Every structure is written in structure tokens, then in C-alpha cells.
Design a protein around this nucleic acid. Structure first.
Ligand SMILES: [Mg+2]
Ligand SMILES: [Mg+2]
Ligand SMILES: [Mg+2]
Ligand SMILES: [Mg+2]
Ligand SMILES: [Mg+2]
Ligand SMILES: [Mg+2]
Ligand SMILES: [Mg+2]
Ligand SMILES: [Mg+2]
Ligand SMILES: [Mg+2]
Ligand SMILES: [Mg+2]
Ligand SMILES: [Mg+2]
Ligand SMILES: [Mg+2]
Ligand SMILES: [Mg+2]
Ligand SMILES: [Mg+2]
Ligand SMILES: [Mg+2]
Ligand SMILES: [Mg+2]
Ligand SMILES: [Mg+2]
Ligand SMILES: [Mg+2]
Ligand SMILES: [Mg+2]
Ligand SMILES: [Mg+2]
Ligand SMILES: [Mg+2]
Ligand SMILES: [Mg+2]
Ligand SMILES: [Mg+2]
Ligand SMILES: [Mg+2]
Ligand SMILES: [Mg+2]
Ligand SMILES: [Mg+2]
Ligand SMILES: [Mg+2]
Ligand SMILES: [Mg+2]
Ligand SMILES: [Mg+2]
Ligand SMILES: [Mg+2]
Ligand SMILES: [Mg+2]
Ligand SMILES: [Mg+2]
Ligand SMILES: [Mg+2]
Ligand SMILES: [Mg+2]
Ligand SMILES: [Mg+2]
Ligand SMILES: [Mg+2]
Ligand SMILES: [Mg+2]
Ligand SMILES: [Mg+2]
Ligand SMILES: [Mg+2]
Ligand SMILES: [Mg+2]
Ligand SMILES: [Mg+2]
Ligand SMILES: [Mg+2]
Ligand SMILES: [Mg+2]
Ligand SMILES: [Mg+2]
Ligand SMILES: [Mg+2]
Ligand SMILES: [Mg+2]
Lengths: 156, 77, 50, 102, 50
RNA sequence: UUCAAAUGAGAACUUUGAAGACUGAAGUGGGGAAAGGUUCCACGUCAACAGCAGUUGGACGUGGGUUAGUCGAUCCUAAGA
RNA sequence: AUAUGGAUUCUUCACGGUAACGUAACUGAAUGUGGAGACGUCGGCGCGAGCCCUGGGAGGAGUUAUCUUUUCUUCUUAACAGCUUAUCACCCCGGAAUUGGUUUAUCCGGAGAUGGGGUCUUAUGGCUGGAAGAGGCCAGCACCUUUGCUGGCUCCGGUGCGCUUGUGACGGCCCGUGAAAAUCCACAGGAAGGAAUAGUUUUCAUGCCAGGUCGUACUGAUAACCGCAGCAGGUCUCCAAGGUGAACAGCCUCUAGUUGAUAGAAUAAUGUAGAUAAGGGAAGUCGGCAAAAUAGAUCCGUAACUUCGGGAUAAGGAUUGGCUCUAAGGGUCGGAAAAAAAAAAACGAUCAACUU
């Protein structure tokens, strides 16, 4: 009983690797009759030939580790390898910050929250790194509005 | 290949002299309100292309199956 | 551990054998009287061609 | 928005291996609604006539969940290997035997 | 090669028929000196050089 | 690497099941180019060959197999002849 | 090859739109002109595809003394076709200094910006057809050289400095500016050609026929090729999962694939490869040869010299796990008879990343 043929077939027919195929060891006489891709298909549906289950790879350990990770778990120096830059490029950090600063400055000019002349300055004042983050901008804005209102109330 | 829209225009196609066969397919789908209904596609094989009319309304569907030329071969499902 | 004998007089199976269950197998070879007759009548014994 | 799941306990019960009351007692206590157990707020009700068990749920719940609790309670009582949770139609479920021989 | 000018593939054919064993009725022809085919060639040992 | 079974005159080495392992996607995976030329695949087989063995084989014997208006060549020019 | 329908014409070779252009069409020889074919390399950015991750749901498998709304897995959609969809670009209105718009990257504007309203390329995506009838996942029936049959379910989302890759508009580089031809199209041109009882037309729709020759198996290498061989050598290329980590590094696994390199019994010398050593610390040797020490990241600190750019990671210090916290960093939307057999009837909300 040499089954190397029928095992090569079943693999192609059941549409899976040779290593996942299973031939019933007690039907050995039976399977030896197969010899044809058609024959085999009886044997698959019949149940005497079977597809083994994919061996299990669970991600559960990593899920758990990434879950804790996003609680800010192991960021400690000892857990770092690449440089600060290699982790999170400065250029990306910059680009993110400006975009936010500009979409802000945009939305304001179009809500009439600021005039054009004032805008044009904070665009230049922004590109030149005068604002750490989005709140710091709106602060200087609030200070510039209350600024031209102490020049207006004393010009009244 | 081509979906036909007009039903007065589809009915000319049904003759056209080059169309030997056609078919009526029945599907079970559900509308945007998530309710089960019956859709019907009229498939007609032209020489060089396939025309299919879609009717979601069941009534104008069932009656249009009587609107077919009797000479023309029809496969139900 | 193989089978379980229930109060209704019912033997229930084990899940470990699950594919010996779903596996159908060959039926008995059942000879017709025509064939049955002939087989018990046959004295020619063929191993050899050499 | 409430969905209705129903399990058929009939075949193992009348052959003597199963308790629809015990099984239903369990479901109530082990079902987690938006948190820990017992918390069913009249958002979930396990009711049983004895040939069928019925979960009616407004709260987050599924076939999977129900199969995971029922396949779990099976193990408690060692009726795993003698019985299997199986779906006849969507949300209409059945507890059955693998090989029944006379 | 797998993409071959016809002239090449035409050649390979000839080779395939020049390798088969001597026809076993020939050994019994009167005054025959030929024991077996000496011009046999095995794809592994001797290349044809086209 | 290990255990059982089948096969067989004969099993450390063949086939199946079980188990343990490794390549770890820049692979021991899936395809191709040049080159080879039937090695492909089945049946039968074990004299020589596979620096042990052999029931196995890219070995030996008998056969079967390669399907195009669209994938290539064919057409065009390059350095050149 | 050709026929029917459409379209054009008594204003013969169509009409609309201010325009960019539009459309189911709408004659066009000689000759001419223009386009495509047709193009480096690198950098970042935007968009897409596939993959990766991930929530809800419908199934099947696994584990369950104890815990886990749990772990694994199926839930897919081609060429081709219609309708729609873009950055760039261009058009009309209008007329800007209180200089404005704008990219990550500072370029743009009276040779007409911003703003208002449009036009196009269809790269790419979207909905529908193709097409669920296919494929996949489950529960079933019968049949053993018939072979199939029957049921269900194939659904709805999210996220990104992610990975490969396509592409776009950009920027950088050069005493280097990174093929050619077949082939097809448009245009200028007006030869020629033709209506009113009729004719033009095949760049519109539909219909009819034909598509020759040769290649096509398999290997592509720790056995199919070259090395005299089944030789640790040599030999161009595509696709590429999870974790750790800066990483296509190393180490572990998943899909697929192998488990083939003569075996058994003992464990002496000398070996080959790999290791460790008290005290000393190059006293060894032609010679610190060989080996050891150092190493990642973060924070501090960093000389002489110098072509002012370097030297420089100079030298030299300190920190690094686990756990619980704190703070900071965003998007979207709202202000003939008898018997027997057999057959049939300045807020608010909400959503979400990690990185310090
Ligand atoms: Mg920290
Ligand atoms: Mg990085
Ligand atoms: Mg920088
Ligand atoms: Mg020669
Ligand atoms: Mg061995
Ligand atoms: Mg490994
Ligand atoms: Mg191949
Ligand atoms: Mg072979
Ligand atoms: Mg053989
Ligand atoms: Mg030998
Ligand atoms: Mg021998
Ligand atoms: Mg041979
Ligand atoms: Mg044809
Ligand atoms: Mg071609
Ligand atoms: Mg050109
Ligand atoms: Mg399309
Ligand atoms: Mg669709
Ligand atoms: Mg589609
Ligand atoms: Mg189907
Ligand atoms: Mg889908
Ligand atoms: Mg991306
Ligand atoms: Mg590449
Ligand atoms: Mg091939
Ligand atoms: Mg390969
Ligand atoms: Mg080699
Ligand atoms: Mg060779
Ligand atoms: Mg040679
Ligand atoms: Mg790669
Ligand atoms: Mg990885
Ligand atoms: Mg990482
Ligand atoms: Mg890696
Ligand atoms: Mg290794
Ligand atoms: Mg292989
Ligand atoms: Mg082996
Ligand atoms: Mg060796
Ligand atoms: Mg001894
Ligand atoms: Mg020492
Ligand atoms: Mg010491
Ligand atoms: Mg010392
Ligand atoms: Mg000395
Ligand atoms: Mg000395
Ligand atoms: Mg020396
Ligand atoms: Mg050294
Ligand atoms: Mg120095
Ligand atoms: Mg230092
Ligand atoms: Mg600490």
C-alpha cells in the first residue's frame, strides 16, 4: 500500500497543504483504490479523508501586552532601542502640529472670529514656531482680540 | 454586460430578430428599511451583449412576464 | 470514556471520535444469486503469469 | 430593539441527562450585561417551559455568547463529550447527541 | 529552455526515438551479432550539445 | 529523531497514523529567465545505479501527456552586423 | 463584407454654451503641421490598491478544577460596460497696499490675486450591470465502478508616521539635462463630391463573417543547469504573515515545506569547534597574533589641533525592570367442468491615536 499519490491529490482537491491532509489509517486498503481526482472527492465527502484543523496561533498574549501598552506601561528608558527620532520622526511631529495650527487659523478666518490682516500675521507667526500647540495659539489670539479692544475703548 | 432601464424600449429588444433566448431570475433581498422583498431581473442575450432589466416592484414584474413574445425561448431561473 | 449507556437504553457517543462518526464507509458486498452461485463454483486459482 | 434566542433541551432531558431548570438558573447568574453578572435590568430574561429555554434580550448578546455559556455549563457537569450545542436556524438552537445507538 | 525554436524541438524528438531498447524479436535473426543497443543515452550522464 | 500498523522472503531508511522537531515570508514556500531535454505522470520492476539499505527513486521496462484572434515569438528600431 | 434604425440637407456638409467646452452622430484627396509612442535619479508630502490590526453579527472547532461576552477559523466579487467622482490646468464676473492667498518644504498676484460662479482629464474611488445562478461556511439525506439531491447562512462597520506597491503635484542634483523607429490620431488645407420628391454618410446604434505558423510538460538547484559526480562552489528575477525591536538585523511562531544527508555501542589519548578559571596582568612573542574588555537608548560633559566644514559617539560620568498614578500633546458636529401456479383491472457634545 503506497499512498504517496493519493495524498498528493487530496491536497489539490481539498485545496490545502499536504501537511493538513489526513488519511484514515484503517481504510488504507480502501484509499488505494482512489487513483483519480474524482474518486478522491467521494472519499472527502464520505469522511474517510479529512482536512486537519489549522494549528492555533493566538494573538491573545500580544493583545494583552498592547492593551497594557496603551495604558502607557513599558515606555521606560530600558525598553527603548532606536533614538528618539527613529521612534517618532521630528518631521512628522512638526507636520502634524502646523496642519492643526493651520486648520485652526483657517476655521477662524471663515467664522469671522478674526479679520484677514490679523490672520496673515499668525500664519507667518505660526510657521516660525511661535506656538507650542493648539491651545497656546488660541491664547495669543484671545490676547490679540482683547488687545485691539483696549486700543478701541481708549480710542473711544 | 449592459443594464437596460426603459421598459418600453426593453420590449423592442425582446424581438429585434437576433435574440433567440432570455431568462427570468428571482432574488430575495431587502430594502433600505430592512424588509424582505422580491426582486426580478430580466436577462436577454443579444448577439454581442447581455441586457438585463431590473424590477423591484413585484406587480409590474409578474405582468411583464406575460408581455414576452411566445416564440422567444425563456429560461425560468 | 468510549460510549455512555443511558436510562432509555441508549448508547451515546464521545466527541473524541467525532470524525469516525461523520465518516461513512463501504457497504457489505452483497452477491446476487447469479454471482453467489459462480463464486462457490470456481476452481481456477490464479496467482502466476511468468 | 429586542432579539429572541431559543434553545431546544428536549432530547437530552427526556433521556435523563439534563436539567432545563438547573441550566436556566446558571444562565441568569453568569450572564454579563455591560459588566459583571446578575446585572440583568429587565433588559434580559431567561424563561423556561422545560422542553425549551428562551433568552429575550435588549442588551448586547449573541449566539456566540449563548453558545459559550451553554458550552461552559456543559463542562461543569461533564456533559461535554456527550452533547453538543448546534444551530438549527438563526437563533433557534439545539442540544444533541453525537452518536445515539439503540 | 521552455521556449524553443522549432528546429531545436524537432531535434529532441529524434533523440527520443533513438533511445529505446532493442526490439526483442531481433535477437533471433540468423547471423545477428547484436546483443543490445549500445547507442543508448541517458539525459543525466551525456548531454547532446543541442 | 521516536513509537505503532500496513506492505514484504526481508524494514534504522517505503507508505499511513501518532508524536517531537526545523526552514521562519532576504524561506528549505509559490512562480519564472538562461541551460537541460522527457527528468513530468501512471502501471510493472529491483541485475547494475542512489560511496549503508531499499519493498523506494530524477534508476530500469511498458505506455500517456504540452490545445491560444487576446500569453510570447512573428512587426519596429538601438549599439551594431 | 454589408443591411436596417438613427442623424444631416430647400440656409446642402448638425446644432447648444458669453466662455473654458458640450453631444449618440454630423462629408473632406493631394500636400503640410502638431501630439502621442517617449523616457534620469534622489527627497519629503497627498491620494488609491492589497496586506496588517480591529468592533458588532451569523455559523463551525478549541480550552473550561479555576478565570476569559473567550482563543482559532468562514463571511469573497474578475476583465468588460453604464452613471458619477480630482489634484493640476483653463474660463466669465470682478478689480486688490492696511499687501493678500498658500505648501511640511516661499512661492503666487494689475501679463488680473483673494473671493463668487463654472469647464475639463477619469488616474482613482463610488452605486448598478457582469453576479450569485458562481464561489465559500455549516446542518443534513440517500448512493458504492450510478451521483447526486436538499436545506439554510454568505451581513454591517472602524483605525493608521503601519508594510509592500501604483500614482499625483512638487522640490534637489549635474562642465552628466538622462534612446530610436514602427504604429495611431488631431489639425491647417479645400481637391472632389453631392438634396427637395428627394440623397450623404459606415469616426453613432444594431446586425453578419474570419482570424494563419511556431513555442506551451517539468526542474530552475544542499539530486533535473556549469563545475569529469546525486560535488558545502557557482548562476539573473517577482510575491512576502504575527511578536519583540529603530529595523527586510538576530531570536520564537502561523500558511506552505521538509524531517534528506550510513547507523549502533562505549566516552581513552591527540585533535576540530565551543566554554570557564583562583592571585598576578603582556613578565608571553619578531609583533598584544589569538582571545577578553566596550557596545543599545536618555540626560549631562567633550580638549589639542583645523583647509573653520571638522575633529566627535572625542575622552569622561549618571540612568535603564515591574507596578499604580499625574500632566501635556488631536478630529467631527452644534453658537364443457373441477383443482393448482403466474400476471393484469470663550464654551458644548461626541469620537480616537499613540508619544513624550
Ligand atoms: Mg514613561
Ligand atoms: Mg521610524
Ligand atoms: Mg529635522
Ligand atoms: Mg560534441
Ligand atoms: Mg535517517
Ligand atoms: Mg525555529
Ligand atoms: Mg514550474
Ligand atoms: Mg515522478
Ligand atoms: Mg511504482
Ligand atoms: Mg549501494
Ligand atoms: Mg543493493
Ligand atoms: Mg526512464
Ligand atoms: Mg472567434
Ligand atoms: Mg500581445
Ligand atoms: Mg514626442
Ligand atoms: Mg468602470
Ligand atoms: Mg451590485
Ligand atoms: Mg460591481
Ligand atoms: Mg451558492
Ligand atoms: Mg461583503
Ligand atoms: Mg497608508
Ligand atoms: Mg522593489
Ligand atoms: Mg507550465
Ligand atoms: Mg524557486
Ligand atoms: Mg550547490
Ligand atoms: Mg551536470
Ligand atoms: Mg563537461
Ligand atoms: Mg521583498
Ligand atoms: Mg514583522
Ligand atoms: Mg514595535
Ligand atoms: Mg522581523
Ligand atoms: Mg535558527
Ligand atoms: Mg521542494
Ligand atoms: Mg524519508
Ligand atoms: Mg556527507
Ligand atoms: Mg568497554
Ligand atoms: Mg585568571
Ligand atoms: Mg580575578
Ligand atoms: Mg590592571
Ligand atoms: Mg616583552
Ligand atoms: Mg622573552
Ligand atoms: Mg610583523
Ligand atoms: Mg586582534
Ligand atoms: Mg581624536
Ligand atoms: Mg562617552
Ligand atoms: Mg525606576
Amino acid at each position: 500500500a503506497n499512498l504517496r499519490t493519493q495524498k498528493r491529490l487530496a491536497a489539490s482537491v481539498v485545496g490545502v497543504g499536504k501537511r493538513k491532509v489526513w488519511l484514515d489509517p484503517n481504510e488504507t486498503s480502501e484509499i488505494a483504490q482512489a487513483n483519480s481526482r474524482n474518486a478522491i472527492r467521494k472519499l472527502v465527502k464520505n469522511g474517510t479523508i479529512v482536512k486537519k484543523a489549522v494549528t492555533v496561533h493566538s494573538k491573545s498574549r500580544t493583545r494583552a501586552h498592547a492593551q497594557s501598552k496603551r495604558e502607557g506601561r513599558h515606555s521606560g528608558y530600558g525598553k527603548r532601542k532606536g533614538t528618539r527620532e527613529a521612534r517618532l520622526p521630528s518631521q512628522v511631529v512638526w507636520i502634524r502640529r502646523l496642519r492643526v495650527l493651520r486648520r485652526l487659523l483657517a476655521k477662524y478666518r471663515d467664522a469671522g472670529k478674526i479679520d484677514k490682516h490679523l490672520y496673515h500675521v499668525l500664519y507667518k507667526e505660526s510657521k516660525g514656531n511661535a506656538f507650542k500647540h493648539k491651545r497656546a495659539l488660541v491664547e495669543h489670539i484671545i490676547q490679540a482680540k482683547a488687545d485691539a479692544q483696549r486700543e478701541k475703548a481708549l480710542n473711544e | 454586460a449592459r443594464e437596460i432601464t426603459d421598459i418600453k424600449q426593453f420590449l423592442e429588444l425582446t424581438r429585434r430578430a437576433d435574440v433567440k433566448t432570455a431568462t427570468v431570475k428571482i432574488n430575495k433581498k431587502l430594502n433600505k428599511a430592512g424588509k424582505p422583498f422580491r426582486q426580478t431581473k430580466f436577462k436577454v442575450r443579444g448577439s454581442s451583449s447581455l441586457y438585463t432589466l431590473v424590477i423591484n416592484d413585484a406587480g409590474k414584474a409578474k405582468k411583464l412576464i406575460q408581455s414576452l413574445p411566445p416564440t422567444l425561448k425563456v429560461n425560468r431561473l | 470514556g468510549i460510549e455512555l449507556h443511558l436510562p432509555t437504553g441508549i448508547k451515546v457517543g464521545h466527541r473524541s471520535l467525532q470524525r469516525y462518526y461523520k465518516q461513512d464507509l463501504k457497504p457489505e458486498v452483497i452477491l446476487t444469486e447469479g454471482q453467489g452461485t459462480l463464486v462457490a463454483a470456481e476452481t481456477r486459482s490464479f496467482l502466476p503469469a511468468f | 430593539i429586542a432579539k429572541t434566542f431559543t434553545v431546544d433541551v428536549s432530547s437530552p432531558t427526556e433521556n435523563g441527562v439534563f436539567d432545563p431548570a438547573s441550566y436556566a438558573k446558571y444562565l441568569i447568574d453568569h450572564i454579563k450585561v455591560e459588566g459583571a453578572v446578575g446585572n440583568l435590568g429587565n433588559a434580559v430574561t431567561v424563561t423556561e417551559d422545560g422542553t425549551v429555554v428562551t433568552v429575550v434580550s435588549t442588551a448586547k448578546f449573541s449566539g456566540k455568547y449563548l453558545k459559550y455559556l451553554t458550552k461552559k455549563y456543559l463542562k461543569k457537569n461533564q456533559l461535554r463529550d456527550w452533547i453538543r450545542f448546534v444551530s438549527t436556524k438563526t437563533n433557534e438552537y439545539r442540544l444533541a447527541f453525537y452518536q445515539v445507538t439503540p | 529552455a521552455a521556449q524553443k525554436s522549432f528546429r531545436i524541438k524537432q531535434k529532441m524528438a529524434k533523440a527520443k526515438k533513438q533511445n529505446r531498447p532493442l526490439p526483442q524479436w531481433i535477437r533471433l535473426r540468423t547471423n545477428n551479432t547484436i546483443r543490445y543497443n549500445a547507442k543508448r543515452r541517458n539525459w543525466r550522464r551525456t548531454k547532446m550539445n543541442i
